Amino acid sequence: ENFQKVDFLGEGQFGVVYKARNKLTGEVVALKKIRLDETEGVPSTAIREISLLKELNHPNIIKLLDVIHTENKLYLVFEFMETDLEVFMDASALTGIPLPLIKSYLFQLLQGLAFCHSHRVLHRDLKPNNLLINTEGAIKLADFGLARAFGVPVRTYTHEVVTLWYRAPEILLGCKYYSTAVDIWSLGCIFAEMVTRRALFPGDSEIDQLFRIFRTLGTPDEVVWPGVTSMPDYKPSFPKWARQDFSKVVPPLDEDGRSLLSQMLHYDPNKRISAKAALAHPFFQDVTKPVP
Amino acid sequence: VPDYHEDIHTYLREMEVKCKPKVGYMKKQPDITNSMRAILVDWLVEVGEEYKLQNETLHLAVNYIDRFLSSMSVLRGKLQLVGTAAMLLASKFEEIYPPEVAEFVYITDDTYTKKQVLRMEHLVLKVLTFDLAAPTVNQFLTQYFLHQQPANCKVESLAMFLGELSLIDADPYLKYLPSVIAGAAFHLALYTVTGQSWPESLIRKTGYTLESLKPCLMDLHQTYLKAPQHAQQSIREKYKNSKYHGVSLLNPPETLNL
Ligand SMILES: CC1(C)CC[C@H](Nc2ncc(C(F)(F)F)c(-c3c[nH]c4c(P(C)(C)=O)c(C#N)ccc34)n2)CN1
Numbered sequence A: 001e002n003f004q005k006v007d008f009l010g011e012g013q014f015g016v017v018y019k020a021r022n023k024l025t026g027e028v029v030a031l032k033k034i035r036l037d038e039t040e041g042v043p044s045t046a047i048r049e050i051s052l053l054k055e056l057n058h059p060n061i062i063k064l065l066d067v068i069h070t071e072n073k074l075y076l077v078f079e080f081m082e083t084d085l086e087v088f089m090d091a092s093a094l095t096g097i098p099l100p101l102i103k104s105y106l107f108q109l110l111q112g113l114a115f116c117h118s119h120r121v122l123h124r125d126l127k128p129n130n131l132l133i134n135t136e137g138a139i140k141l142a143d144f145g146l147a148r149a150f151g152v153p154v155r156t157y158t159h160e161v162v163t164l165w166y167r168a169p170e171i172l173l174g175c176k177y178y179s180t181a182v183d184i185w186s187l188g189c190i191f192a193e194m195v196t197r198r199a200l201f202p203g204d205s206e207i208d209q210l211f212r213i214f215r216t217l218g219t220p221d222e223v224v225w226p227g228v229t230s231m232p233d234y235k236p237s238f239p240k241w242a243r244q245d246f247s248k249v250v251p252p253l254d255e256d257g258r259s260l261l262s263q264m265l266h267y268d269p270n271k272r273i274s275a276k277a278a279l280a281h282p283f284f285q286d287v288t289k290p291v292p
Numbered sequence B: 001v002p003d004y005h006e007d008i009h010t011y012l013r014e015m016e017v018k019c020k021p022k023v024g025y026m027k028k029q030p031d032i033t034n035s036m037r038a039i040l041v042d043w044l045v046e047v048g049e050e051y052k053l054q055n056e057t058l059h060l061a062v063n064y065i066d067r068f069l070s071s072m073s074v075l076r077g078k079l080q081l082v083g084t085a086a087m088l089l090a091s092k093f094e095e096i097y098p099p100e101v102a103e104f105v106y107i108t109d110d111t112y113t114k115k116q117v118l119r120m121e122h123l124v125l126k127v128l129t130f131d132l133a134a135p136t137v138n139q140f141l142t143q144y145f146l147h148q149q150p151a152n153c154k155v156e157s158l159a160m161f162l163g164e165l166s167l168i169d170a171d172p173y174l175k176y177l178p179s180v181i182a183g184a185a186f187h188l189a190l191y192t193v194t195g196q197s198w199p200e201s202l203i204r205k206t207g208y209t210l211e212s213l214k215p216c217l218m219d220l221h222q223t224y225l226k227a228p229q230h231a232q233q234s235i236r237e238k239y240k241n242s243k244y245h246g247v248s249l250l251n252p253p254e255t256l257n258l
């Protein structure tokens, strides 16, 4: 192509990503070679990612620059991002991330999510390595391959969704319907991860994941989540742990932060705060702009 | 009432203008006709029933087909191949468990090969520039149904029925936006079953008065009246099942009496 492969970034099931240079314009890009190798032609994940990204023009959402499609070859050309949240947290593991930057990053991320949700898109794979950071201090949602356009109201969608550590309880307990609330859970976990520099709920299995959540937020019952005891994968034998104090779970956080974080981590998806409502939360009355 | 319901509706109203096919496209097609399109869509309804696909998938396929035929000339011998690929793409976009290509070939009866169907997928994607997330009559109907104070399962199925009938006849239904057809459908269903009319709450949400819906209503009334006579019957057949409360068997009203 007009592209020079600069560096290999990683191989997935979804496919191969290279850092590349436009040899004519100099523009640095990330090239996603889609794993076609294809009994069924173009993968659904590729079709969803392009069709939904072409519709999502926002400062806090990755820019799709171009699609190069032949037979047995499909490349996606994205803006190249210098760093990601996973990497920035590691290089901050001791120092810490300053609270005002945390706040700014969370504000931005909510701005991107609100935009998605208001354009009827569920992300469904939020996690630190999908949250990319550029030199100008912008953080953007990326990797929309597991996303989906959703209906008003919703119907049943795919069950195997969200990485374990960031998976909302309604999905772990196998509810028929899920919606925008599962993305908010994911962000709550990440907010908490920026503060403490450790994964909030690192399960190694579905049950272990529930238990990590319950140990921290309390075991849910009919009181805080009506209908919960009726659910497919709920068991009456679940240990009955008490909700921990948030002052202990996330020490660095002020009153406003705790209040927001607990609203993002409500068990009942109906009580759980929307991206849009969260932007109006007092926690952000003094938020600052993206800066390099 | 879910979060962002008014935002999504506003977005859908923007996107339905941009996602519209060229109104007069069949005139400029040398080899195919409204009647041939009808046979295709009707066949696509049967494909949906056999493979237990969502209503939405069928409405998207049709939107893809019409946008494609707006840009490309197709011979009648190849029209079914465009529909197969449109149905494959719609399924990939919307279904949890889309049929595999081998099964799309089976449902055509080996009229085409796995090779042709995959390649036509390629070409449809190019022609649509990968813009597959189109608003449908379906998406507008489900939006409108939330504004029924007493939810009526029979009004809902019938509204869906009428919306599906509009997919068959390019003349006159390409003239109208999905949001207006849906408006027409909902009112006609409501009126038929309960005698009620286009609610004051939907007037506010859409900005469409019963009066502004009259053109589409006069058409849709007619389509409903003559539905037992129509060549294509897969939709009337589908909506006999218990799943849709046998709404296809209801007698329509003689007088709309707006
Ligand atoms: C470790 C770093 C800091 C080095 C640079 C990388 N910069 C970047 N800029 C744009 C994109 C985008 F979004 F444009 F592609 C991507 C990207 C997105 N998904 C990726 C993957 P996945 C999650 C598909 O596996 C893998 C793997 N392996 C590797 C890269 C990406 N990365 C970010 N992380």
Ligand code: NA
Pocket (backbone or CB within 6 Å): B026, B027, B028, B029, B030, B031, B032, B033, B034
């Ligand atoms: Na013609």
Ligand code: NA
Pocket (backbone or CB within 6 Å): A152, B005, B006, B009, B143, B144, B146
């Ligand atoms: Na609504």
